[PDB]
């Protein structure tokens, strides 16, 4: 919990909680979290 950021229930909190990003920034290609938990907890190579 290194500098826990405050977000809503809709927004995605990082694994450590150090940052919050949008739910629209879950699964896009880039890494928005402190590590990469935003795309780690995401479908592994989406079919289509
Ligand atoms: Ca992302």
UniProtKB/Swiss-Prot annotation:
The cysteines covalently paired via disulfide bonds are: 7-20, 14-33, 27-42
Which residues have a glycan attached per UniProt? 6
Q: What does this protein do?
A: Multiligand endocytic receptor. Acts together with CUBN to mediate endocytosis of high-density lipoproteins. Mediates receptor-mediated uptake of polybasic drugs such as aprotinin, aminoglycosides and polymyxin B. In the kidney, mediates the tubular uptake and clearance of leptin. Also mediates transport of leptin across the blood-brain barrier through endocytosis at the choroid plexus epithelium. Endocytosis of leptin in neuronal cells is required for hypothalamic leptin signaling and leptin-mediated regulation of feeding and body weight.
Q: Provide the family line.
A: Belongs to the LDLR family.
Q: In which tissues is it expressed?
A: In the inner ear, expressed in the lumen of the endolymphatic sac where it localizes to macrophage-like cells as well as to mitochondria-rich and ribosome-rich epithelial cells (at protein level). In the inner ear, expressed in marginal cells of the stria vascularis, epithelial cells at the spiral prominence, epithelial cells of Reissner's membrane facing the cochlear duct, and Kolliker's organ (at protein level). Expressed in the choroid plexus epithelium in the brain (at protein level). In the brain, also expressed in astrocytes (at protein level).
Report the source organism.
Rattus norvegicus
- This chain belongs to the protein called Low-density lipoprotein receptor-related protein 2
Output the PTM entry: A fraction undergoes proteolytic cleavage of the extracellular domain at the cell membrane to generate a cytoplasmic tail fragment. This is internalized into the early endosome from where it trafficks in an LDLRAP1/ARH-dependent manner to the endocytic recycling compartment (ERC). In the ERC, it is further cleaved by gamma-secretase to release a fragment which translocates to the nucleus and mediates transcriptional repression. N-glycosylation is required for ligand binding.
The source's domain of life comes to Eukaryota
Its gene name is Lrp2
Q: Could you say which residues bind Ca(2+) here?
A: 25, 28, 30, 32, 38-39
